[PDB]
Each structure stands twice: as structure tokens, then as C-alpha cells.
Structure 1
Amino acid sequence: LAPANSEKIRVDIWSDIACPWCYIGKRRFESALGQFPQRDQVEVVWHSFELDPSARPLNPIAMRDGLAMKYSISPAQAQGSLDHMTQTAAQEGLEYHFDRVKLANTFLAHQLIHYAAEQGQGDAMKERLLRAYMSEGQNVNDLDTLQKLAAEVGLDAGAARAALEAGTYAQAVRYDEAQAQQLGITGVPFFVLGGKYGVSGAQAPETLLGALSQVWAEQHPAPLTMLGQDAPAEGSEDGQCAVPQ
């Protein structure tokens, strides 16, 4: 989890397309980054996460009922979360329609994001899939649908669908998920900063900005004022006579 460039700080993010807090979290992270003076020095690495890797391809029940059954809570509790997430999302410029949500297995969707990332379109693909899931009632387990969404993002639709059908990025997705399991990440969005600090959930942009700033200040403190004269290192049996100063 080290940055490719030494001068920079790295942020690793785990996220599932099926999680409304991940879209909210994306917007809040983007806000934080926008306010971070050293944003250009940030390497962001996104990772696939499945809330339920064994989820059936499509569960045709209403999202409220899926939530209630998954979390062992009442339909009323579930609706409460749905309404809260919808209201919170509106403040991030997100208009959700949970009444249309298709409870789909997101494994192929994650593979499509990996394909897109190889074409320089990882973020656009992610954003498109989050919108398709949360607002447009699209089934992101459906290959027709995934291919269409890839086309809308500007990808080679035939090539994208071939990659999905071949399972080209299946291993990469499982690898992302394995990493999260090893780090003890059991919910999303999850941010790792500087390979050291964790932030759990879609916290405020102020909090993410604070983490960025803190990590930056730690890894790049103000340089010391050096006194005296730096000692010669081993191998330097040398000397000079200097002029009176």
C-alpha cells in the first residue's frame, strides 16, 4: 500500500456499487480533495468490495425488504435508513430512487470497473454504475445492461463485454476483496491513508480533509534548522584546512 512516488501520499478506497453510502462517500471524498492544497500529490487507489459475494444474481424483492432481511431489522427500520440515505444523498447532489433498485450481485460490475480503469476510464465507469444502481433502476448483474453502460462511458462495448464474458478481471476483483478481508475491513466505504490510517464509512468532507492534512504533515514535516556542521560518514578519513571564518 505504498505510493508509486515518494513525494506523494496514498489513499486506498474500498467500495461496493450496491452501497448508497459509497456514492455519498465518493462525493464527500471529492469535496475534501478539492479543498486539499496538496491534492496533486495524492495517489488514489480504488478497490472492489462486495457486501455479499454470494448474493444471487438478482434478488427481485424491494430494497427495503432486502435490507430488513439482511440486517435482521424491521421493515420500518429499513425504511428509516432508506429515507435517511436519500435525504443525505440529496445534499451531495445525488437524487436516489431506492424504490427502483434492483438487488443484483455486483461481481461483474466490479470487473467492468477494472476493465474501464485499464482504459483510463475507471472513475467514469464507477460513477455511471453507481448512478445506474441507485437512481435508474438498472440491473448491474445483467450483461446487456453492463455493456450498454460501458458504451455510454465511451468504452469499446464489444471489447468490454468480451472481457466480462471471459472473466478477465475476476481474479483482480477477488484480490481487492481479499485485501479488505485481511485488513479487517467489514463495511464500506473504507479509506486507508498513508497505508496506516483507517477511516470507516462515508464521513464528512471536513474529516477526510483533516485526515489528508494530518497524514501530509506527518510524512512531510517542516525541515529542521541544522546547527554545527554535518559529520563525515564512515569511509571518510579526510580533512581540509578552512580559511578563518
Structure 2
Amino acid sequence: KIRVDIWSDIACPWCYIGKRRFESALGQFPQRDQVEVVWHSFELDPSARPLNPIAMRDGLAMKYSISPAQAQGSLDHMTQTAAQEGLEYHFDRVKLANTFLAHQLIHYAAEQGQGDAMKERLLRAYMSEGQNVNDLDTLQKLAAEVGLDAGAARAALEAGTYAQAVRYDEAQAQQLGITGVPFFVLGGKYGVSGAQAPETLLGALSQVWAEQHPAPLTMLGQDAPAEGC
């Protein structure tokens, strides 16, 4: 097996682009059935208020200290880039929500083996559908659409069951020196930073697989005294 640990935020347009680019690489990878993908929580703004009422453009402009026009240029670039991945962004509709509860929902989903589908649904909800991913009703609905037990998902969110696990994911990232997302870890050994091209990720997958499958040796001589486990 090859394990791929991916750190990502729901509020992260480059993370969604990166998810698609990774999926393209994985589709090209002959041993894709041997790959285990695990999503890990990362918050770009863990101190974000529950819901920040301003436009994403203005939020971005404040974050990077730039003009509304250049902030718009940035949004436009990301929109155009995402369109090449089949993604239709609607930044004008984005609700600037704290994503802590959404990350908790992905943790809930992953216990049911639906981590990726939940991650995917939340990215779409955030980037394309103008949904508030801090809103409990909204999260419950999205859980239902993914095929989860909507009532159980809601209860887990209200109890904060996966809160610690999310914070641990975030601490893990800090310890690994991960300061920007999306970030890929392969085989617990190799780091790949940002929304890399499919070719790069496919190359990494292939490199790791090859490393774990050396050519069999040609044995010489007879077995001599040896010790084993």
C-alpha cells in the first residue's frame, strides 16, 4: 500500500484545484487501487468568526493588503484555473465561515469510510454553491446528501466529538512544517507542497511505488548459517 495524507481547508480554492489535480494523477497511476488517501484538517483561519459578512474579494484584499482590483484579478485567476479542472467557482456567493465544524463533519464521515465524499461535498458547497459551512442545518443537509446518518452527524457536531481530532490534525501539520495547503505526504516520507500538476503527483506516486518494490535478487550459493525473527 501507499498512503497519501493530504492537509487541506474547505475555505481554500487552491485546495479544491489540488484535489482535482491529485485525482487526475491517481487515475493515471496503474497501482491506484493500492493507494490509501486520508484527508487531514487544516484551517487557514482557525480564529475566524462563525460567519464574516464581507465579500470574499474584500476579505482577500485585507488578507494580502492589495487593491480591490488586484484582489478581483486573483479571484478571476483562480476561477479560470478551476474551470480547467471542471470546477465552476462562484466567489461572489462565498460565505466566509469558520470551517472548524465542517472539518469535524469530515472526521465523522471518515469513520463511515466517506471522508473523501464529505470533503468533496463541502468544497463544492463552499466554493460553488454559496453555502454557509459553519451552519449546523447546512452541515446536516450536506451529510445527508453524502449518504450519512444526518441525525447522527448533527449530534456528533453538537457534541464536538471530533473537535480534538481536528485540532490534532492541525498540530500535526505544524509539527511537519506544513504552513500552506494543499499539502501532500506520501508514505509518511515525502512532502509535496501546493496544487501540483498531475504529472508531478503521478511521478511521486510512481517513485514511492518503485522504492517499495525493488527488483528481486538473484541468489548465489547455498544457504549458510543465518538468524531470523
Residue by residue, what CA displacement relative to the aligned partner does 1:90-110 show, whole Å, maximum 9, x if unpaired? 111100000000110000000
CA shift, 1:120, in A, is 2.2
Residue by residue, what CA displacement relative to the aligned partner does 1:124-177 show, whole Å, maximum 9, x if unpaired? 211111111001101101111111111222222111111101001001101110
Higher deviation after alignment, 48-57 or 222-231: 222-231
Aligned partners of 2:128 and 2:193: how far apart in 1?
24
CA shift, 1:43, in A, is 1.7
Instruction: State the secondary structure of the residue aligned to 1:44.
Output: strand
Aligned partners of 1:128 and 1:76: how far apart in 2?
30
Aligned partners of 1:195 and 1:155: how far apart in 2?
30
Question: Does the C-alpha gap of structure 1 residues 229 and 76 become closer, same or farther in structure 2, counting only changes over 3 Å?
Answer: farther
Structure 1 unmatched ranges of 5 or more = 1-7, 236-245
Residue 32 (structure 1) aligned with residue 25 (structure 2): yes
Structure 2 unmatched ranges of 5 or more = none
CA shift, 1:34, in A, is 0.9
Aligned with residue 228 of structure 1, among 204, 210, 221: 221
TM value normalised by structure 1: 0.90
TM value normalised by structure 2: 0.96
Aligned partners of 1:219 and 1:166: how far apart in 2?
42
Residue by residue, what CA displacement relative to the aligned partner does 1:8-49 show, whole Å, maximum 9, x if unpaired? 121110010000111111111111111111111112221011
Q: What fraction of aligned residue pairs are identical, expressed as a percent?
A: 100
Q: Which has the larger radius of gyration?
A: 1
Q: May I ask how many residue pairs the two structures share in their alignment?
A: 228
Instruction: State the secondary structure of the residue aligned to 2:22.
Output: helix
Aligned partners of 1:176 and 1:85: how far apart in 2?
26
CA RMSD of aligned residues (A): 1.3
Q: How do 1:91-170 and structure 2 match up within 5 A?
A: 91-170=84-163
CA shift, 1:225, in A, is 2.0
CA shift, 1:123, in A, is 1.6
Higher deviation after alignment, 11-20 or 37-46: 37-46
CA shift, 1:234, in A, is 4.8
Aligned partners of 1:223 and 1:82: how far apart in 2?
51
CA shift, 1:76, in A, is 2.5
8 Å contact from structure 2 (residues 39, 116) kept in 1: no
Higher deviation after alignment, 220-229 or 9-18: 220-229
Instruction: State the secondary structure of the residue aligned to 1:211.
Output: helix
CA shift, 1:196, in A, is 1.2
Aligned partners of 2:196 and 2:227: how far apart in 1?
50
Aligned partners of 2:65 and 2:177: how far apart in 1?
22
Residue by residue, what CA displacement relative to the aligned partner does 1:183-219 show, whole Å, maximum 9, x if unpaired? 0101110001111111101111111000101111112
Question: Does the C-alpha gap of structure 1 residues 150 and 231 become closer, same or farther in structure 2, counting only changes over 3 Å?
Answer: same
Aligned partners of 1:234 and 1:191: how far apart in 2?
39
Question: Does the C-alpha gap of structure 1 residues 234 and 168 become closer, same or farther in structure 2, counting only changes over 3 Å?
Answer: closer
CA shift, 1:228, in A, is 2.5
CA shift, 1:122, in A, is 1.5
Instruction: State the secondary structure of the residue aligned to 1:130.
Output: helix
CA shift, 1:231, in A, is 2.6
CA shift, 1:73, in A, is 2.5
